Design a protein around this ligand. Structure first.
Ligand code: HEM
Ligand SMILES: CCCCCCCC/C=C\CCCCCCCC(=O)OC[C@H](O)CO
Ligand SMILES: CCCCCCCC/C=C\CCCCCCCC(=O)OC[C@H](O)CO
Ligand SMILES: CCCCCCCC/C=C\CCCCCCCC(=O)OC[C@H](O)CO
Ligand SMILES: CCCCCCCC/C=C\CCCCCCCC(=O)OC[C@H](O)CO
Ligand SMILES: CCCCCCCC/C=C\CCCCCCCC(=O)OC[C@H](O)CO
Ligand SMILES: CCCCCCCC/C=C\CCCCCCCC(=O)OC[C@H](O)CO
Ligand SMILES: CCCCCCCC/C=C\CCCCCCCC(=O)OC[C@H](O)CO
Ligand SMILES: CCCCCCCC/C=C\CCCCCCCC(=O)OC[C@H](O)CO
Ligand SMILES: CCCCCCCC/C=C\CCCCCCCC(=O)OC[C@H](O)CO
Ligand SMILES: CCCCCCCC/C=C\CCCCCCCC(=O)OC[C@H](O)CO
Ligand SMILES: CCCCCCCC/C=C\CCCCCCCC(=O)OC[C@H](O)CO
Ligand SMILES: CCCCCCCC/C=C\CCCCCCCC(=O)OC[C@H](O)CO
Ligand SMILES: CCCCCCCC/C=C\CCCCCCCC(=O)OC[C@H](O)CO
Ligand SMILES: CCCCCCCC/C=C\CCCCCCCC(=O)OC[C@H](O)CO
Ligand SMILES: CCCCCCCC/C=C\CCCCCCCC(=O)OC[C@H](O)CO
Ligand SMILES: CCCCCCCC/C=C\CCCCCCCC(=O)OC[C@H](O)CO
Ligand SMILES: CCCCCCCC/C=C\CCCCCCCC(=O)OC[C@H](O)CO
Ligand SMILES: [Cu+2]
Length: 309
């Protein structure tokens, strides 16, 4: 393919690896405790540090794979940030903002995680971790995307598209609002309001399906926030399907968004129905990661378009 130094495809490999590790650090948090002394241990049995005799269990692998990914992340993120900065910036000026964002948020989630070991009883603060971890992953994802695009003459995704004002409103607005919905979700978890409402869409058989207790309000607030996000994405997708059919990155970008929002909602409903089976929890952290990734891709398009035009 390219006669340039073979070491370049290694920067692409590092990008893929780091993006993957950061995704693991994020979604892996749905399987292990993120607060208290049992932090790092499978959520179903907070005791994995110390007393137990047995080893090589499928739940022990999760715990090892998460702590390993979290440790190796510092090495990977710093290397990716530096290398991409040295090599990719000439073509993409955004490279530096991303390299920096990657480092800052990797450190912020590590900082918040360290504190969660002892202040995990503060749900309002603990609910900030996911969103931070989410941006840490999305920064590395977009950086990796630029790394690939930098080595192509006819770019696939990072193309100078014409983004109208309305579409910009939807993109930026949905991005910001999704982050808010992400907080309410994290708040449900760390406030233990996950199973306060056995039913869906309403709370339970009693009180007409309306919340009457703390945990029911948190649960219901999250669902209500999610519904609005869902509706907004439908409106945003319809505008793309109608006015951006000629700009396929936006057309398909939003259709994928529509699909990720659907899978997010469904896995959310299954968390409840399954009474928090961790497989659905894992899915619920994954699909929002995909959606947010696409929304951050859109933000890059706007950032470049506003620079160009
Ligand atoms: C489609 C838009 C939705 C988004 C963007 C979203 C996002 C999130 C996020 C980021 C978390 C936090 C996870 C964590 O801190 O490990 C969460 C948790 C949760 N969500 Fe959603 N969510 C959505 C919809 C729903 C729906 C429609 C339901 C249910 C009817 C639901 C039920 C839950 C439950 C029960 C938790 C707590 C899980 C736990 O204790 O680990 N979500 N959500
Ligand atoms: C423990 C293991 C650590 C190692 C993990 C390795 C992960 C390899 C992943 C990708 C390789 C990227 C190779 C890039 C090849 C250059 C050509 C290219 O850019 O292909 C792009 C592709 O089609 C898309 O757009
Ligand atoms: C609400 C929460 C929103 C979270 C979005 C944060 C990071 C997404 C990753 C970056 C997305 C692309 C940004 C590109 C950019 O800002 O480029 C600046 C400029 O060229 C200077 O280097
Ligand atoms: C809250 C954390 C916000 C952190 C925001 C970090 C932004 C870093 C930045 O703006 O770096 C720009 C660079 O020097 C030029 O392209
Ligand atoms: C606590 C930090 C949580 C959210 C801050 C998000 C800050 C994201 C800053 C992105 C700036 C940007 O997207 O510039 C274009
Ligand atoms: C696994 C994580 C993989 C994330 C890789 C993001 C970069 C990418 O896939 O870019 C593709 C495009 O076609 C480039 O020209
Ligand atoms: C159809 C559903 C509609 C829901 C409306 C929600 C209302 C306010 C959210 C505002 C969030 C902040 C959005 C800022 C967007 C922006 O900055 O737009 C820039 C662009 O160039 C020029 O409009
Ligand atoms: C509702 C709570 C916060 C709204 C935050 C709205 C942030 C609006 C940012 C608008 C913008 O990004 O203009 C460029
Ligand atoms: C937001 C918290 C508002 C707290 C007060 C709400 C009272 C209420 O709406 O309870 C009605 C009904 O029995 C069930 O939804
Ligand atoms: C969703 C985001 C914030 C909701 C916070 C909800 C806080 C609910 C506190 C408990 C409560 O309001 O219970 C009142 C009453 O007995 C019954 O409506
Ligand atoms: C005319 C009535 C509402 C315009 C609302 C503008 C945003 C609507 C997004 C969904 C849509 O269907 O957009 C179609 C078209 O381009 C719209 O001017
Ligand atoms: C990695 C970070 C997240 C990226 C997600 C971005 C878009 C999702 C949908 C992409 C669908 C493929 C679009 C290809 C296309 O638009 O081709 C058109 C034509 O050749 C003229 O440019
Ligand atoms: C993975 C999540 C959703 C899949 C969405 C995949 C959408 C990929 C569509 C790519 C495409 O069909 O490109 C069309 C082309 O430019 C003209 O016919
Ligand atoms: C149209 C909006 C429907 C929202 C329903 C939410 C529930 C389905 C969730 C994900 C599937 C997404 C499938 C999107 C199918 C779009 C088909 C399309 O793009 O047809 C356009 C045509 O070629 C030119 O006008
Ligand atoms: C599309 C794939 C849909 C997969 C749906 C899985 C349904 C399921 O197995 O539900 C199990 C749960 O633990 C019971 O409440
Ligand atoms: C590169 C990233 C690699 C990871 C990508 C996949 C991540 C999440 C998808 C999870 C899908 C979960 C589907 C439902 C599972 C389920 O039904 O769990 C049930 C439970 O154990 C009782 O019945
Ligand atoms: C880490 C791997 C997941 C990255 C998730 C981000 C974008 C998904 C784009 C999917 C392609 C849509 C066509
Ligand atoms: C923190 C709150 C919103 C993210 C700030 C970024 C909002 C989008 C700004 C778009 C932009 O200015 O791209 C250049
Ligand atoms: Cu309680």
């Amino acid at each position: 393919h390219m006669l340039e130094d073979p070491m370049n495809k290694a920067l692409k490999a590092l990008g893929v690896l780091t993006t993957f590790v950061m995704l693991i650090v994020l979604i892996g948090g749905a399987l292990v405790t993120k607060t208290g002394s049992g932090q790092g241990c499978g959520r179903q049995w907070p005791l994995c540090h110390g007393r137990f005799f047995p080893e090589l269990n499928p739940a022990s692998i999760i715990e090892w794979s998460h702590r390993f990914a979290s440790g190796i992340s510092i090495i990977l993120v710093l290397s990716l940030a530096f290398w991409s900065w040295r090599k990719i910036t000439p073509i993409f000026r955004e490279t530096t903002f991303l390299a920096i964002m990657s480092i800052i948020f990797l450190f912020l989630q590590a900082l918040l995680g360290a504190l969660a070991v002892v202040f995990g009883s503060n749900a309002l603060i603990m609910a900030l971790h996911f969103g931070i971890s989410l941006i840490s992953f999305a920064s590395v994802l977009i950086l990796t995307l630029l790394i690939f695009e930098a080595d192509k003459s006819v770019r696939t995704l990072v193309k100078p598209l014409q983004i109208g004002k309305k579409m910009q409103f939807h993109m930026i607005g949905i991005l910001i609002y999704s982050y808010i919905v992400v907080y309410t979700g994290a708040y449900v978890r760390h406030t233990e309001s996950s199973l306060a409402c056995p039913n869906v869409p309403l709370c339970s058989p009693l009180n007409n399906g309306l919340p009457t207790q703390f945990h029911e309000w948190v649960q219901m607030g999250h669902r209500a926030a999610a519904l609005l996000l869902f509706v907004w994405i439908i409106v945003a997708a319809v505008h793309a399907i109608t006015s951006y059919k000629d700009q396929k990155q936006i057309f398909w970008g939003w259709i994928s968004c529509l699909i990720f929002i659907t899978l997010q909602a469904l896995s959310g409903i299954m968390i409840v129905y399954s009474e928090l089976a961790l497989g659905f929890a894992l899915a619920h952290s994954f699909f929002i990661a995909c959606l947010f990734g696409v929304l951050c891709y859109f933000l890059l398009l706007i950032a470049r378009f506003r620079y160009e035009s």
